[PDB]
Amino acid sequence: EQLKHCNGILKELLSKKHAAYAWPFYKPVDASALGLHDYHDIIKHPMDLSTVKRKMENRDYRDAQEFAADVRLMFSNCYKYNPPDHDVVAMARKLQDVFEFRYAKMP
Ligand SMILES: CC(=O)N1c2ccc(-c3ccco3)cc2[C@H](NC(=O)OC(C)C)C[C@@H]1C
Numbered sequence: 001e002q003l004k005h006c007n008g009i010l011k012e013l014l015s016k017k018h019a020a021y022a023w024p025f026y027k028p029v030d031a032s033a034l035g036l037h038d039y040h041d042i043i044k045h046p047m048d049l050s051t052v053k054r055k056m057e058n059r060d061y062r063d064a065q066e067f068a069a070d071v072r073l074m075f076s077n078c079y080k081y082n083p084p085d086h087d088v089v090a091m092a093r094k095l096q097d098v099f100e101f102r103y104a105k106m107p
Pocket of ligand 1: 025029030034036077078081082087088
């Protein structure tokens with residue numbers, strides 16, 4: 001019911017319209033490839049949109065709140081790991097505003 005609306009939100013976050021700032025969240029952070037040695041010490045519970053998508057498809061979310069908690073975890077990890085002036089942080093804030101807008105307007 002509210003879960004079905006969550007699918008629409010996720011689709012919005014992954015759509016072309018937001019690609020210029022969403023693209024770094026499309027896949028799990030690869031610490032080795034990016035050369036962030038300490039990412040997995042600092043970030044204990046990694047998250048990204050393709051993981052949210054899988055969990056949605058497998059019906060791992062029992063309600064809208066659990067879905068929101070994973071999306072917020074993704075943004076929180078980013079703010080936690082990266083300095084406040086980093087470009088990826090500015091990208092996260094823009095994507096999060098889209099997310100909090102759609103989540104707040106859900107019936
Ligand atoms: C989402 C997130 O917290 N990160 C992330 C994730 C993916 C990629 C990445 C790069 C290529 C594919 O994925 C890069 C980063 C960031 N480093 C960076 O130059 O970001 C630019 C967008 C300014 C570092 C950070 C660990």
